[PDB]
Amino acid sequence: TNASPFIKRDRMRRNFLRMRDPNEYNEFPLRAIPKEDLENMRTHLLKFQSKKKINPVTD
Amino acid sequence: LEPGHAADQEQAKLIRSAIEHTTLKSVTIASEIYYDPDPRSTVIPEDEEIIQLHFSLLSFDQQSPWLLRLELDRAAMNDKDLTMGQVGERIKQTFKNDLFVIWSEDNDEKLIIRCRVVRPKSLDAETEAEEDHMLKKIENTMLENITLRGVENIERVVMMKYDRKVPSPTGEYVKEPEWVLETDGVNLSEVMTVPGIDPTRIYTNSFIDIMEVLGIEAGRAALYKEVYNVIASDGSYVNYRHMALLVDVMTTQGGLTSVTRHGFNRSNTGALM
């Protein structure tokens, strides 16, 4: 009805306490470059920013 | 409205359209710049007929190949009583004869205006670069600086039916309805001269324009009415003489003096006061 107008906490505490593969591929080796040639040598990446084809070998 | 024609709702529309300021921008969807190789044939399928119509019925040798096309809304030109013939002349009179214009008929499914600028006899080799740009300029000014009809500074007008008590022929007071136009924006001097309205009853919300057009005494009455409306808006009642004294003080110096330090405090009433 009124879903219990009262806050029942005095005895509700007691109640709870009371209740308780086939070779169809190609495989190649991968070997690291010798470090003896990487010293005093820097390898960078070059990116041409353009929409056409740029090739310094021929262009 | 005129006392004789106050109840005629059909004439109210004539007055309403004759005072509302409308520009081409408010009655158009889009404007486009089209290029035609010659001013005798068209590339758009739609205007294939309009050119054949006007041209057959009919100078054009020196017309520029750049075309300005305006597409007007069918509904918009029907909300306000308008026809492409009148607006076409309106454009024709803004620039008297420096550009050629053709306009479709009302029966057409789409309402289109085609404009062409005619170059002078002298050839300007430098203007070809800005030829299209110039079209982009005039079209913008043709959307804004064109007054199809109405009084400037008049945004919109709405029709309302008010009740006023006028004496009856028998001798009693009876309430009859009349059509009254309410407007946003104020141009009292120009609107007061429009035919069809009652200039002896026009009222303005801003009492400043009343004073400039009708005089200080008219501004005095308008000022009181504005003050009275504010007081009476909430239903409170104040004796007339209290408001009259405030209004009289506000207009005693041959003008509307504010109640701030720039108004009554700039008089000559003693430094100590």
Binding site: - | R201, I216, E217, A218, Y240, G254
Partner: protein, 214 residues
């Protein structure tokens, strides 16, 4: 040809307003000519083509007998309508000469668009005669007929003397009205002239006020 009719109608209304202004200033103007019908105006002040001849619209008015008794110093009045839109010094110069030549005490000049500054500065140059310039667009509607504008009556010198004496006032203690006031321009008031404003009051029915031109 609609535009032609629009100007004619506006000119006719402006002519009527000027006639009422002259009548209200205390000059002899019959009521019949004030209410001239539109068709009569188009018959006497227009031509075969239809465009009006504003030169012929100019007329002469003289003080009425009652005004002479109250103001025994007012002379004739001349009203001139300028045919050309742009008023120049040439037309202004002949207008003032036409006033000074025939002893016209007051001359009203009506222009269409504007008067050039080189001609405006010449307006106050023929005393004691006075020249008043009126724009036609401003004369289309008689502002004095508005319900908000009360009745203004100019007071004679004797009446002004009595007004101050009985109220024991000074010219600085009266309510002021500007010379540039639309009603003051309609009446041609001068500095020191007092006008009796008769207006309807909801507390006393009729209330009489006074304003001194400044």
């Amino acid at each position: 040809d609609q535009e032609n009719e629009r100007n004619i109608s506006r000119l006719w209304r402006a002519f009527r307003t000027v006639k009422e202004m002259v009548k209200d200033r205390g000059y002899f103007i019959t009521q019949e000519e004030v209410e001239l019908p539109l068709e009569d105006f188009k018959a006497k002040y227009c031509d075969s083509m239809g465009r009006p001849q504003r030169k012929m619209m100019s007329f002469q008015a003289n003080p009425t007998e009652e005004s002479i008794s109250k103001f025994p110093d007012m002379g004739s009045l001349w009203v001139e309508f300028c045919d050309e839109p742009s008023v120049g010094v040439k037309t202004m110069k002949t207008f003032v000469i036409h006033i000074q030549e025939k002893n016209f005490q007051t001359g009203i000049f009506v222009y269409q668009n504007n008067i050039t500054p080189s001609a405006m500065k010449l307006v106050p140059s023929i005393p004691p005669a006075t020249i008043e310039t009126f724009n036609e667009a401003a004369l289309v509607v008689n502002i004095t007929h508005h319900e908000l504008v009360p009745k203004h009556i100019r007071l004679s010198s004797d009446e002004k003397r009595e007004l101050l004496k009985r109220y024991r006032l000074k010219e600085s203690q009266l309510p002021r009205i500007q010379r540039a006031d639309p009603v003051a321009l309609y009446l041609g008031l001068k500095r020191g002239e007092v006008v009796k404003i008769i207006r309807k009051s909801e507390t006393s029915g009729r209330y009489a006020s006074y304003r001194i031109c400044m």
